[PDB]
Ligand binder design. Structure first.
Ligand SMILES: N#Cc1cc2c(Oc3ccccc3OCCn3ccc(=O)[nH]c3=O)cccn2c1
Ligand SMILES: [Mg+2]
Lengths: 405, 547
């Protein structure tokens, strides 16, 4: 019954973010959901003296619709102060586990009440078509689902609920990132799935509903190493590209030599002309291959800094990505295959996969550099989004020339 | 009664304190008449000297013309008053309206004065009536209702009106009620008898809350003169638009042209907009351009033919069809039935240079898509002048994620196409040009050239060129002196980028020359090499131009 008082960071006003226009199916979904939430006391109507607003969308993971609030601005103003006061530890064992299943614990928050002096900052608007009516305005009376403050406040009761299960299963690792429970075990998949249902029954008995992205396997995850081509005959063009790729790798890997290989191209030769590799340059090539074979070392995750994600579209539905905090020091690199289907759908799936990996590995989400025109992304990203969180993103309109994975 | 919205001032601010300016005694008496009347109806109340706050009071002296009015400047009170949830700036578009059997406009009278003001805030609205003689102390009042100039009256009136309407809307869901400032537009498909019945029920229901409606005279004239439009029961259009012009006369002309482009297809404003560059003085005249004057002549011809838009039918698909009209300019129509348009519009290129007609087409589809969701709540089906093979080739090879909704080719020229395609692999038996450029930052002069495998070489001296212009000019030279099949090797990351983006046209004259050479070639391969690494002829051309 007691409400944890919540304050904003000093010198910060509440969020004032415009509601993006919605489709009629999405609006109708939102009114259904919010009517029932209003009946249940979770949200209530607000007057014009409340100037704040936070975007709201409807996604469908589940034929039934589900509401998603974009609390990114409120989090930038609350969570950072709230993360120091009430932080959540992150286990380095989650990445080690063989299987991790992700459960939605969002219904848990709706029982704990929110401090009344904070509720106004949780204002959102259901928009109207063609501006024929004013937007329906609500604010939260209970802990909001996407708010990074919500798991922080509920953390105490979450630890009580999970204690019997953790006693009965000391091997399983359980991590809470906002709205989700990450449950890692090294059991057999059929045994792991059985334990998950036991955990779901446990939470249900204690009054946490979970719905009826998942089944992740962190130990199968491995980096995408830099690979030089291996040919029997090399055109001048082939060597030029090899020198350019090897020149590129010099920034990430110290010790890359392009001297002998550059000597092969001395003079003004035709691109098609095959070049026999000198024995010295064959040594320089193989030396760089072994340097690129062994994994990179000396990059340490810095929790004070921001993770950032870059994504390049390759063909055939292939996408590559790099996660870093410093420009040429990559914490991870990967590549995705997409079983063409919409580029945008492929991209939104990639962003969700990367974020999930970055939550498991670091308990942090990266800020994405999305290679897509902002308006296209803002119109259609919601059509394929299935996650309870939303990462930070910017847009790059400048093509990366390298495309060297 | 009506519930008050609790209002507050900004955190570090206090109520206004402004001394009223002296006013003519004829007006002063008229102000006394207005305020005594408002005192009678409960809208204002006389304030004692305990209230310190004051705001300036003006007036217009009573006359046959509408000059018998009380004005109050609340600008300082507004600057001290909190922010509110802004009432929506977007105005309902007629092409999103659904035709109803009948539609009545009910405007509210004394709308702001029918809603009470928060009592704790009333003190700040205090105003002092001027004294006829300077020796007389002035009489002072404060508002008990929403003041007409106050920052919070629009939004507090809107929210109060929503709460009053909620039961009746629940009671009668077939009836569609639209809200706009001080107005209620009520439409239905009931029989004419029942429609006028529910209006009176609504008219009576608002009166119980103190809101007066134009029940006797409904402005029932089916053609409504609303916000620049004509709303007929069967159609909508724009209000008539009036066709030597100084700089400001151009700006209002372009505005009226854009307003006309909602429904009149083919309105063009690009030439006039280029004329309206800089020249911030409205008084200064703009020189008339024959091409710009032609633009007005074509527009006048279009405006002669009356155009009407149709209202929206939720049961039919929205079709959007786009035409590339002119360079950088696009026009589009939106319709459900083959020749009856819901509305019209235009789209123009972004500011950036080195664009592609395919990029522009995709962006235009993007613009129309967002417009549709705002107006109708769904996206349209598209009819576009681009082959499916052109688009598929473009999307598969384009570094960005791109998408367009379902669309059908329309064989209406000008067709959108790719003027050239670069080769993915080097061309055998085609001469290989190693190009480079260089220039001095202190002296704008520079050089550019190439060296090839066949021993060909060239250097040309340049004036007023940057390093990037030279690197781009060096590629231009190689194309000019090459056969139909050429391989070019450059170190310029900048030049690679411009050409890789496959621009159709550009603002820079050099890039246009490059595109036209590319179109004339049969095969071009461009390859990039690291600079200053002793690679190939890159080192040789580096010395040939930087020496
Ligand atoms: N003064 C004015 C005015 C009227 C309206 C307005 O009227 C409607 C109200 C509810 C439902 C459908 C409506 O109109 C549907 C379209 N329509 C409009 C006018 C008419 O006579 N018949 C008709 O079907 C809507 C929006 C802005 N307005 C401005
Ligand atoms: Mg150089």
């Amino acid at each position: 019954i007691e409400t944890v008082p919540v304050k904003l960071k000093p010198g910060m006003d509440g969020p004032k973010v415009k509601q993006w226009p919605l489709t009629e199916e999405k609006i109708k979904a939102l009114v259904e959901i919010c009517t029932e939430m209003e009946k249940e006391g979770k949200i209530s109507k607000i007057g014009p003296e409340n100037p704040y607003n936070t975007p709201v969308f409807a996604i469908k993971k589940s034929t039934k619709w589900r509401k998603l609030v974009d609390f990114r601005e409120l989090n930038k103003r609350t969570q950072d102060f709230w993360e120091v006061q009430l932080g959540i530890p992150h286990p380095a064992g989650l990445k080690k586990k063989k299987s991790v299943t992700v459960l939605d614990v969002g219904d848990a928050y709706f029982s704990v009440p929110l401090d009344e002096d904070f509720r106004k900052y949780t204002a959102f608007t259901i928009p109207s078509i063609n501006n024929e009516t004013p937007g329906i305005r609500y604010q939260y009376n209970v802990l909001p689902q996407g708010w990074k403050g919500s798991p922080a406040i509920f953390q105490s009761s979450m630890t009580k609920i999970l204690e019997p299960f953790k006693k009965q299963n000391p091997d399983i690792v359980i991590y809470q990132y906002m709205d989700d429970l990450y449950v890692g075990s090294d059991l057999e998949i059929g045994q792991h799935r059985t334990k998950i249902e036991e955990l779901r029954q446990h939470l249900l008995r204690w009054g946490l509903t979970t719905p009826d992205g998942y089944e992740l396997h962190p130990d199968k995850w491995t980096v995408q190493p830099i690979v030089l081509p291996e040919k029997d005959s090399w055109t001048v063009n082939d060597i030029q590209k090899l020198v350019g790729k090897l020149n590129w790798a010099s920034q990430i890997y110290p010790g890359i030599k392009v001297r002998q290989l550059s000597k092969l191209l001395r003079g003004t030769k035709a691109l098609t002309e095959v070049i026999p590799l000198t024995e010295e340059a064959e040594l320089e090539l193989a030396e760089n291959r072994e340097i690129l074979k062994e994994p990179v070392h000396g990059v340490y995750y810095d929790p004070s800094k921001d993770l950032i994600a870059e994504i390049q579209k390759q063909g055939q539905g292939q996408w590559t990505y790099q996660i870093y905090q410093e420009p040429f020091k990559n914490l991870k690199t990967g590549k995705y295959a997409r079983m063409h289907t919409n580029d945008v759908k492929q991209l939104t799936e990639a962003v969700q996969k990367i974020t999930t990996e970055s939550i498991v590995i670091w308990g942090k989400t990266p800020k994405f550099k999305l290679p897509i025109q902002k308006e296209t992304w803002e119109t259609w990203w919601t059509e394929y989004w299935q996650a309870t969180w939303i990462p930070e993103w910017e847009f790059v309109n400048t093509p990366p020339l390298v495309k060297l994975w | 009664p009506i519930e008050t919205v609790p209002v507050k001032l900004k955190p570090g601010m206090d109520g206004p304190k402004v001394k009223q300016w002296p006013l003519t005694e004829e007006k002063i008496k008229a102000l006394v008449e207005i305020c005594t009347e408002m005192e009678k109806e409960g809208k204002i109340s006389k304030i004692g000297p305990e209230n310190p706050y004051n705001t300036p009071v003006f007036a217009i002296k009573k006359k046959d013309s509408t000059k018998w009015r009380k004005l109050v400047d609340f600008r300082e009170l507004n600057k001290r008053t909190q922010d509110f949830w802004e009432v929506q700036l977007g105005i309902p578009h007629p092409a999103g309206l659904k035709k109803k059997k009948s539609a009545t406009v009910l405007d509210v009278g004394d709308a702001y004065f029918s809603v009470p003001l928060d009592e704790d805030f009333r003190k700040y609205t205090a105003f002092t009536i001027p004294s006829i003689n300077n020796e007389t102390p002035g009489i002072r009042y404060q508002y008990n209702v929403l003041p007409q100039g106050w920052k919070g009256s629009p939004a507090i009136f809107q929210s109060s009106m929503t709460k009053i309407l909620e039961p009746f809307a629940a009671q009668n869901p077939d009836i569609v009620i639209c809200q706009y400032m001080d107005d209620l537009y009520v439409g239905s498909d009931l029989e004419i008898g029942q429609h006028r019945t529910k209006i009176e029920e609504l008219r009576q229901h608002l009166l119980r809350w103190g809101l007066t409606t134009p029940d006797k005279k409904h402005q029932k004239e089916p053609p409504f003169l609303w916000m620049g439009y004509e709303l007929h029961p069967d159609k909508w259009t724009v209000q008539p638009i009036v066709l030597s012009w100084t700089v400001n006369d151009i700006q209002k002309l372009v505005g009226k042209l854009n307003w006309a482009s909602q429904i009149y297809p083919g309105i063009k404003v690009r030439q006039l907009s280029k004329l309206l560059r800089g020249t911030k003085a409205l008084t200064e005249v703009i020189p008339l351009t024959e091409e710009a004057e032609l633009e007005l002549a074509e527009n006048r011809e279009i405006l002669k033919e009356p155009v009407h838009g149709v209202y929206y039918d939720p049961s039919k698909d929205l079709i959007a069809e786009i035409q590339k009209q002119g360079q950088g300019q696009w026009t589009y129509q939106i319709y459900q039935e083959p020749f009856k348009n819901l509305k019209t519009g235009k789209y123009a290129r972004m500011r950036g240079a080195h664009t592609n007609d395919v990029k522009q087409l995709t962006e235009a589809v993007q613009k129309i898509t967002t417009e549709s969701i705002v107006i109708w709540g769904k996206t349209p089906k598209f009819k576009l002048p681009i082959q499916k093979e052109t688009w598929e080739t473009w999307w598969t090879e384009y570094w960005q994620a791109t998408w367009i909704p379902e669309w059908e080719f329309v064989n209406t020229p000008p067709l959108v196409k790719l003027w050239y395609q670069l080769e993915k692999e080097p061309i055998v038996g085609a001469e290989t040009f190693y190009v480079d450029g260089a220039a001095n930052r202190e002296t704008k002069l520079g050089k550019a050239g190439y060296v090839t495998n066949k021993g060909r070489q060239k250097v040309v001296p340049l004036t007023n060129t940057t390093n990037q212009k030279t690197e781009l000019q060096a590629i231009y030279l190689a194309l000019q002196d090459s056969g139909l099949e050429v391989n070019i090797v450059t170190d310029s990351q900048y030049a690679l980028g411009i050409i890789q983006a496959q621009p159709d046209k550009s603002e820079s004259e050099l890039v246009n020359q490059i595109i036209e050479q590319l179109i004339k070639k049969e095969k071009v391969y461009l390859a990039w090499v690291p600079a200053h690494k002793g690679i190939g002829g890159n080192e040789q051309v580096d010395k040939l131009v930087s020496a």
